[PDB]
Design a protein around this nucleic acid. Structure first.
Ligand code: MG
Lengths: 57, 785, 49, 57, 69, 49, 63, 129, 108, 196, 276
RNA sequence: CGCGA
């Protein structure tokens, strides 16, 4: 889970080469479906997604 | 914007503080438990127990020797009463020989999987023939479990650097019980506001009999010893008013007029005048009232004296209270009142209890007259938290009480055996006690283990059990989650109605709205807004009346008047006097001002000021001041000055409190919340941007956070706890709330920061959805144990 | 396959078996979810053979 | 992110021969002693309604 | 518990830089930003490893069963 | 139909109570049962099957 | 003393019974034994109005 | 009877009772010194530089002045009863709220100053830009 | 307006007491005022007496702490009043023959 | 998730019309003049009165709930899709609700427009006996904002009062989800057993 | 409908199709006339003054209610005249022992009918008030009158059609023009067909219909009623199911619950035996 | 009556 209440089962450990890789070369650690939102109405996670990156930079 | 304080961080881990914890809030969180438990032995008055035992008093039995004077001589009078109670800190004697003992640190109790218990000691006065001969002998009722980090816990006062030396979590907050190595704690409950009349409407009342209405005035009176006694006034449809009380798990009913004459010598005219006051222009009350007086007369024409009344009462209940054969029904009658009616006013409140009892009847008819609205018991307005320590004392007082009963029983059987008996004999005394079974600690330890309350009276507690709950160390959050936890009790869990689990607006800033479990416990388990504090001790009211009487309060002693027509002034359920509403509002405000100002001595800020403005069919008006224990006090900011003020829930309802300074309106708000974050749980505050999430979704987080695989603690090597989870590598969340550092969750990283793409790619993460980079994992990511 | 509670017969269906290596979890295609009413949030299902 | 409890290794079981409760000569809860899986009426009802009746029975 | 050896995402080896990182914040009194950049952490992948890190082993080390107080 | 023993301690379940209440038997061990060749586990989405 | 169908001795504060219940023309306190005549007064009026809480209406449903 | 500490009043002082004179029962805070006072309104006032704001039977001494007689001015012995009641009690004054100080226009989230480019395309440094 | 203060009697002269409305005693009924000097507090207990009745009353302790009552004799022709400190007596009434009425310990 | 610059402008503007909306319904329910100011004593007297009655209080919410919901529509209608910064198909959020993939126009609205009135028992926020819906509101408040109408949107965020309101509705849902589980399940067994 | 299959329900309703002749106003009038009329409805106030006492009744204006509830002050007089007092005096003595010129003739008549009425009067012109006096023993309790009276006034019925409370001309939905009936009495409506269409009368109460129109109509009512539920929630259930259930509950020709009770008649014991 | 849809 995130801190935003998104709970999910790990679906598959995903071979890293198959995990889409950034312009930078950073494959994501976790890949959460973009469809699992509007229903759960959790914006703070998008926001955190920004700030988290924003901080780390 | 907060920071990592990484240097400041590590310097702490490296060198823990040799003076005091760096996370004071974290302590102040658990304060309700320790504040309660320490208060058992503390306070200028000698501690709750020493006050509690003082209530039990003597246990009298008679040998029955004739003396050879038909003769009214009952033999020697044995007087059995305890004197003062002490609790030794946990100590280890080495086998026998009374070799010089060593202190016991809980780390040992954990690893040995035993209870962590201090010894329990009783100074017992064995008296014969009314102090003609008396015997002081100290006893040991067995090792008593002790709350960690309390005044009887050796760990107390240790600087964090020392706890590490004694192998406890550097920040260890204690506040709980080690029982058989299991960590238990008494989860706080919610009980009716003490020392405060409650105009109740319940259908269950009408069910109790034919002429019972559903109306009632319930009050929950609690002695300074924290024993709670309920007294309820049912309004009967015929116009009778039956005082109801409870004793030995049994309900009993009394005509209220009987009791008024029982309390104080008084004239019927005075009672009537004592209620109606200036309201004689009303027919309704008089009509209701005369049927109550003419009711008591000609129901009981053989009672022309308060004494006769007292005698009559004793006549009935002497059986009930097991009164000693010497005690006259006059004498017993006096006890019945003293041990039941409005206990919080003490044995000397006889003249006060009379007034208070009139006040209810006044209010009751008003409720029946519908002039005042009923009072929601579910409403946090009328509620108070019942601390663990106080409960743990209550039970203990019961066991002590029953213990004396056990002694007298041993003697009577020893008497009815006809065996030769000398009360003055010291060896005989020992002969009795050695035969007597005294281990209280085990019984208490039994309690904490089972959480099953076993008592002669239910302690005015609806449910019988569920009082203890295991401390769960899964993550750190779930652990601390317990100490901010509270609920109404399991009896309300089974109720079909869900109104009890409603998010009443009265919980603002007290019960965190966000943090509750889901499913069946939802709406029951609640958590205090992290700034919510509980009053663990009394506050001095000594000079309050002096202040009040100075402020224009007409003494309740004289100046008969009553009714919602004009304000009433009370302290912890004691009528000080009466004022016009307009005056009271000026008073309560002024008083509120001085309270914060602080320059006026004898007026502590924690005192609630309960001013109830008069209204149309609203709550019964008045001015209420609750300084006692177990109040929900929370901080606010006071606008006329700028200073911290403290606010109870009861008084919150009427106070206009702006959330943020920008919302302050002219002549509207007298107060403002410091930060709006003050209304949230620990975890609630921790959820980032929780205002952006959907509320039911945040509400999971609080429940998810408590289920995480976290860092339970650093003591793992020395902790023997059964089943334990630990996340191998935690990370400080970049996105953070300032409280995260204040509460110092740094010491317990609950998770990691993950590079996350919100995308539909693999297709394997459709429903639940969770794709983990494989290589990322194998790098140790999220590795648990 | 069965997902409790079983509201209606479609909540219990037969399935051809494909044996998948490497993992400890039953695993479904999505078309079944609407029937079983299964969200893949800690969901469990009873397999009968 | 927060790794939770409720790891799958804690939750699953299969094919309980062993327990065979003495009264009913039937299996027992899985847990960690080798139980089985309860069926129950709502599951029974489906079989009847589901269609897999011979099988179900 | 202790410094992760590799950046999860990047795979880059982050395990060594920690000591030097503390050194930077300590001695040089840099910000958090530059030190990382000075350590040569470009990808915010490998930056969060050190940046967010906690040495919680330090607290563990305080409990040593193998020695007197 | 049994007299109260010490008004508490609970009555020991009689034969009638074994059959009836809330199960007591028929709907415990008859109308439903624990079975063999059955496995409960966690579902995982696999689109590829 | 005597207010709203209630009758009190001025010595004792007793509430006093039906004036007519006494055969003799004097009313004596039960506690103080203070004696009053039977009727110093005719039975007093005691107006009692029904409240407005009760009933539905057309007009109270309006006004 | 006479309980402990009680010395019965031996000689009671004089109470010169009798448009006639008026009789006023008036409350005061005990802290107020009534022995030194002068005027009084007929409402609010000030006493000792502090400011202040504004059923029962009366007993008169015996002629012996060791005991108490009821107050009756009717000569009917019908009880003389209190003419006027003025409750002189402690008012206090309250500071007014200063809205200009306390009502504070919101301060926006402080922008973090000195944020350069951390990100650069593959194969380039900070200096190149 | 303004009211001149002629006199303040700081020694007992008169006293105020409370029974009920309409409470009346015979003319010969007198009252025995008892006085303790207790700390600074002056606690007055009043024993009233008549033939068949007993009037017993006493000042409240808690009230007289911060409360002070002064009755006064006001000349309306003048602006002056004669101020006299007086106590406030919480009081009750007992008839002697009704007083000692009592029952036995146990009814058998 | 973002509206365009103009969209927010539309959003704000329509919201500004919602101010007096609360006072209006009261004037209507009280049968007082529509222009009765918020503080009128007879207004409050009736508001004080209508509070004490549960039934009449149920009426006031229904009326007000109507009017404010009309406001909500005017927003969502005028704003989405029109004022949205990224447009369908390029806008994913719309593309999901629209295609019925996941979510609904409601969800997208609450994110990009406002949450709107919080229905509790079909009524608005309960009211403390003081006549305050919440410690931060004047007693017997005529504002819709104080009555649970939420002008905030999850994208921009919600004021604390709104939040505490919105937490209520949340609890109502969760409680209701639990009880729906048990109730119906008992019913079905009655049918099956006899119709087996 | 299903488990309890209770005869008495929370909301008994009678759907009353009206023709298109009767006007909306006409409909309203009929609904008011055939509704519920209580004495406590029209009473503005009541005063009790005390051994005897007098009872005043302030009503609304004779026009108002006789317009509003369509009440002849005479029947109103009569409503008060006989039943009302008989009700009144009843609980009175009941409680007592529990504790151990046009007017003139009418008045004389009324007084004769009862023990406790020694005087009577009424407003025979403006109808505004009713006033009368009751006497009791010189030794009698103070027992609360107003509560007795307020209790009777509410129980007191002026005009009611048995089991039918107050109707509410709903809106003529879906082109269908209907009066909604609270409570169920069909025979009552059967005299009313001058306006409504009796052949279109439908109910919300099965067992009532079964009693009146018999099993088939009752059955048809069931499918209709159940459907309304799932209709309201927009859900969709093929009538074939509802047919099966309805046809089942009617299998005995009575209206049988799915609970223990209806299950009694079943032949197979084990089903019953394993149910509850 | 705690944990999971
Ligand atoms: Mg699910």
């Amino acid at each position: 889970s995130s801190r935003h209440g998104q709970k999910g089962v790990c679906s598959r450990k995903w071979p890293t080469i198959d995990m889409p890789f950034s312009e930078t070369g950073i494959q994501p650690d976790i890949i959460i479906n973009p469809h699992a939102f509007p229903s759960r109405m959790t914006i703070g996670m998008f926001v955190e997604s920004l700030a988290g990156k924003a901080g780390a930079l | 914007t907060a920071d990592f304080r990484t240097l400041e961080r590590e310097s702490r881990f490296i060198n823990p503080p040799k003076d005091k914890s760096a996370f004071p809030l974290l302590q102040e969180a658990v304060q309700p438990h320790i504040g309660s438990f320490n208060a058992l032995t503390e306070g200028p008055d000698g501690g709750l127990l020493n006050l509690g035992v003082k209530d039990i008093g003597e246990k009298v039995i008679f040998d029955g020797k004739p003396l050879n004077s038909n003769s009214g001589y009952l033999g020697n009078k044995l007087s059995v009463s305890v004197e003062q109670v002490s609790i030794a800190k946990p100590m280890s004697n080495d086998g026998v020989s009374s070799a010089v003992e060593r202190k016991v640190y809980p780390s040992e109790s954990r690893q040995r999987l035993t209870s962590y218990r201090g010894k329990l000691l009783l100074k017992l006065k064995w008296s014969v023939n009314n102090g003609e001969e008396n015997l002081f002998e100290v006893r040991d009722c067995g090792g008593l479990p002790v709350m960690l980090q309390s005044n009887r816990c050796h760990l107390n006062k240790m600087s964090p650097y020392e706890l590490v030396q004694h192998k406890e979590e550097s920040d260890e907050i204690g506040g709980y019980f080690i029982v058989n190595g299991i960590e238990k704690l008494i989860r706080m409950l919610i009980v009716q506001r003490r020392n405060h009349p409650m105009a109740i409407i319940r259908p269950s009342f009408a069910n109790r009999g034919a002429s019972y209405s559903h109306y009632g005035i319930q009050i929950r009176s609690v002695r300074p010893d924290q024993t709670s006694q309920t007294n309820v006034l049912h309004y009967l449809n015929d116009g009778q008013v039956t005082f109801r009380f409870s004793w030995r798990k049994n309900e009993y009913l009394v005509p209220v007029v009987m009791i008024l004459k029982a309390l104080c010598h008084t004239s019927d005219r005075e009672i009537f005048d004592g209620i109606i006051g200036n309201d004689v222009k009303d027919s309704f009350l008089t009509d209701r009232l005369e049927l109550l007086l003419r009711g008591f007369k000609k129901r009981y024409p053989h009672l022309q004296n308060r004494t006769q009344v007292l005698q009559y009462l004793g006549d009935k209940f002497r059986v009930v209270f097991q009164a000693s054969p010497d005690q006259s029904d006059l004498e017993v009658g006096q006890e019945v009142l003293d041990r039941i009616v409005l206990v919080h006013l003490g044995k000397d409140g006889s003249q006060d209890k009379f007034r208070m009892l009139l006040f209810m009847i006044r209010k009751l008819y008003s409720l029946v007259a519908g002039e005042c609205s009923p009072d929601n018991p579910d409403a946090t307005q009328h509620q108070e938290v019942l601390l663990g320590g106080f409960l743990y004392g209550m039970i203990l007082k019961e066991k002590i009480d029953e213990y004396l009963q056990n002694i007298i029983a041993q003697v009577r059987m020893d008497i009815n055996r006809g065996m030769a008996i000398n009360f003055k004999d010291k060896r005989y005394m020992s002969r009795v006690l050695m035969r007597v079974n005294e281990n209280i600690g085990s019984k208490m330890q039994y309690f904490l283990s089972t959480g099953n309350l076993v008592s002669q009276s239910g302690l005015d507690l609806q449910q019988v059990s569920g009082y203890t709950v295991v401390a769960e160390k899964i993550n750190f959050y779930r652990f601390i989650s317990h100490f901010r936890m509270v609920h109404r009790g399991s009896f309300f869990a089974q109720l079909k109605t869900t109104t009890v689990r409603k998010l009443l607006p009265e919980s603002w800033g007290f019960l965190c709205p966000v943090h509750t479990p889901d499913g069946s416990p939802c709406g029951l388990l609640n958590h205090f807004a992290h700034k919510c504090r509980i009053s663990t001790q009394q506050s001095d009211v000594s000079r309050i009346p002096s202040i009040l009487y100075s402020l224009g309060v007409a003494p309740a002693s004289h100046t008969f008047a009553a009714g919602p027509s004009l304000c009433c002034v009370q302290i912890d359920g004691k009528i000080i006097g009466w004022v016009s509403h307009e005056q009271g509002k000026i008073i309560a405000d002024t008083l509120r001002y001085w309270k914060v100002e602080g320059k006026t001595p004898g007026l502590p800020i924690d005192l609630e000021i309960g001013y109830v403005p008069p209204s149309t069919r609203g709550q019964y008006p008045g001015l209420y001041l609750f300084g006692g224990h177990s109040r929900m006090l929370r901080p606010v900011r006071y606008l006329p000055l700028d200073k911290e003020d403290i606010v109870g829930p009861f008084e919150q309802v009427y106070m206009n409190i702006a959330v943020t300074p920008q919302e302050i309106q002219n002549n509207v708000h007298t107060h403002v919340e410091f930060t709006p974050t003050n209304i949230l749980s620990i975890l609630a505050n921790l959820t980032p941007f929780s205002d952006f999430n959907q509320s039911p979704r945040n509400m999971y987080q609080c429940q998810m956070g408590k289920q995480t695989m976290g860092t339970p603690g650093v003591a793992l090597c020395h902790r023997s706890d059964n089943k334990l989870y630990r996340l191998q590598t935690g990370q400080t969340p970049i996105v953070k709330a300032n409280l995260y550092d204040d509460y110092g969750m740094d010491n317990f990283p609950n998770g990691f920061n993950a590079v996350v793409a919100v995308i539909s790619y693999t297709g394997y993460d459709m429903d639940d959805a969770m794709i983990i980079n494989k290589s990322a994992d194998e790098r140790g990511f999220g590795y648990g144990t | 396959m069965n997902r409790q509670p079983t509201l209606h017969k479609a909540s219990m269906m037969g399935h051809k078996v494909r044996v998948l290596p490497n993992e400890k979890t039953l695993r479904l295609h999505y078309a079944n979810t609407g029937a079983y009413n299964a969200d893949f949030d800690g969901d469990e299902m009873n397999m009968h053979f | 992110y927060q790794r939770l409890r409720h790891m799958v290794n804690d939750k699953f079981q299969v094919r309980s021969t062993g327990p065979v409760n003495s009264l009913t000569m039937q299996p027992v809860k899985g847990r960690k002693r080798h139980g089985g899986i309860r069926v129950g009426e709502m599951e029974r009802d489906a079989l009847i309604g589901h269609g897999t009746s011979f099988l179900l029975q | 518990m202790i410094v992760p050896v590799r950046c999860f995402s990047c795979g880059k080896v982050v395990g060594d830089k920690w000591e030097s990182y503390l050194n930077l914040l300590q001695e040089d009194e840099l910000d958090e930003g530059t030190a990382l950049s000075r350590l040569g952490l470009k990808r915010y992948c490998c930056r969060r490893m050190i940046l967010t890190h906690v040495d919680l082993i330090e607290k563990f080390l305080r409990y040593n069963p193998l020695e007197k107080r | 139909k049994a007299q109260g023993r010490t008004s508490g301690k609970v009555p020991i379940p009689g034969v009638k109570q074994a059959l009836e209440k809330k199960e007591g038997l028929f709907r415990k061990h008859m109308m439903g049962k624990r079975v063999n060749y059955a496995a409960r586990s966690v579902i995982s989405p696999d689109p590829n099957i | 003393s005597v207010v709203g169908s209630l009758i009190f001795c001025l010595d004792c504060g007793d509430l006093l019974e039906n004036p007519n219940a006494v055969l003799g023309s004097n009313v004596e306190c039960s506690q103080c034994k203070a004696i009053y005549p039977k009727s110093q007064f005719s039975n007093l009026k005691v107006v009692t109005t029904t409240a407005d809480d009760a009933f539905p209406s057309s007009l109270r449903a309006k006004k | 009877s006479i309980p402990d500490g009680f010395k019965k009043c031996k000689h009671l002082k004089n109470f010169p009772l009798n448009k006639q004179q008026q009789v006023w029962l008036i409350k005061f805070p005990s802290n107020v010194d009534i022995s030194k006072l002068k005027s009084l309104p007929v409402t609010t006032m000030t006493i000792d530089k502090h400011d202040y704001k504004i059923n029962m039977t009366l007993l008169v001494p015996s002629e012996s002045k060791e005991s108490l007689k009821i107050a009756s001015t009717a000569k009917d012995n019908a009880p003389l009863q209190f003419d006027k009641v003025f409750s002189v009690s402690e008012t206090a004054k309250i500071p007014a709220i200063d809205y200009s100080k306390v009502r504070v226009p919101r301060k926006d989230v402080p922008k973090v100053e000195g944020l350069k480019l951390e990100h650069f395309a593959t194969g380039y440094d900070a200096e190149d830009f | 307006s303004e009211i001149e203060i002629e006199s303040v009697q700081d020694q007992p002269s008169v006293a105020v007491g409370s029974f009920f409305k309409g409470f009346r005693a015979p003319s010969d009924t007198t009252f025995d005022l008892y006085k303790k000097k207790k700390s600074e507090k002056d606690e007055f207990v009043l024993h009233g007496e008549n033939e068949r009745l007993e009037y017993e009353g006493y000042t409240d302790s808690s009230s007289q702490a911060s409360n002070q009552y002064v009755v006064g004799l006001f000349n309306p022709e003048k602006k002056s009043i004669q101020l006299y400190k007086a106590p406030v007596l919480v009081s009750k009434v007992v008839s002697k023959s009704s007083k000692n009425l009592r029952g036995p310990k146990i009814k058998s | 998730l973002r509206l365009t610059a103009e969209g927010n402008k539309w959003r704000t503007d329509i919201l500004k019309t919602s101010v007096d909306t609360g006072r209006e319904a009261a004037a209507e329910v009280t049968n007082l003049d529509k222009d009765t100011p918020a503080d009128d004593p007879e207004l409050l007297k009736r508001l004080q009165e209508i509070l004490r009655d549960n039934n009449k209080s149920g009426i006031l919410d229904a009326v007000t709930s109507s009017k404010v919901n009309a406001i909500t529509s005017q927003v969502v209608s005028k704003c989405v899709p029109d004022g949205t910064m990224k447009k369908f198909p390029c806008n994913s959020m719309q593309a999901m609700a629209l295609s019925g993939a996941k979510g609904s126009n409601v969800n997208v609205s609450q994110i990009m427009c406002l949450l709107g009135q919080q229905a509790l028992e079909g009524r608005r926020v309960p009211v403390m006996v003081s006549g305050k819906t919440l410690p931060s509101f004047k007693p017997y408040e005529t504002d819709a904002m104080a009555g649970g109408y939420v002008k905030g949107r999850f994208y921009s965020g919600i004021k604390p009062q709104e939040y505490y309101f919105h937490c209520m509705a949340g609890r109502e849902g969760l409680i209701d989800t639990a009880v729906k589980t048990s109730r119906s399940g008992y019913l079905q067994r009655c049918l099956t057993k006899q119709l087996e | 409908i299903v488990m309890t299959a209770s005869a008495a329900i929370k909301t008994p309703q009678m759907t009353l199709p009206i023709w298109n002749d009767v006007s909306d106003e006409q409909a309203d009038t009929f609904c008011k006339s055939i509704s519920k009329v209580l004495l406590s409805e029209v009473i503005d106030k009541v005063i009790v003054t005390e051994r005897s006492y007098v009872i005043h009744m302030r009503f609304f204006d004779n026009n108002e209610y006789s317009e509003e509830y369509d009440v002849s002050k005479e029947e109103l007089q009569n409503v008060i005249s006989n039943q009302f007092i008989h009700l009144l005096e009843a609980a009175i003595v009941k409680e007592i022992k529990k504790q151990k010129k046009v007017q003139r003739d009418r008045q004389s008549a009324i007084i004769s009918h009862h023990r406790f009425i020694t005087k009577y009067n009424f407003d025979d012109e403006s109808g505004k008030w009713c006033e009368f006096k009751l006497e009791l023993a010189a030794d009698t309790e103070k027992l609360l009158m107003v509560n007795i009276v307020e209790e009777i006034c509410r129980k007191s019925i002026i005009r009611q059609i048995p089991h039918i409370d107050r109707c509410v001309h709903p809106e003529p939905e879906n082109g269908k023009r209907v009066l909604v009936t609270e409570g169920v009495n069909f025979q009552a409506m059967w005299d009313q067909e001058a306006f409504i269409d009796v052949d279109g009368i439908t109910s919300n109460d099965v067992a009532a219909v079964l009693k009146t129109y018999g099993v088939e109509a009752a059955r048809n009512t069931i499918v209709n009623e159940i459907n309304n539920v799932f209709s309201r929630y927009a859900i969709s259930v093929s009538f074939r199911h509802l047919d099966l259930i309805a046809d089942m509950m009617t299998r005995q020709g009575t209206y049988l619950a799915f609970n223990r009770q209806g299950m009694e008649t079943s032949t197979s014991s084990f089903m019953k035996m394993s149910y509850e």
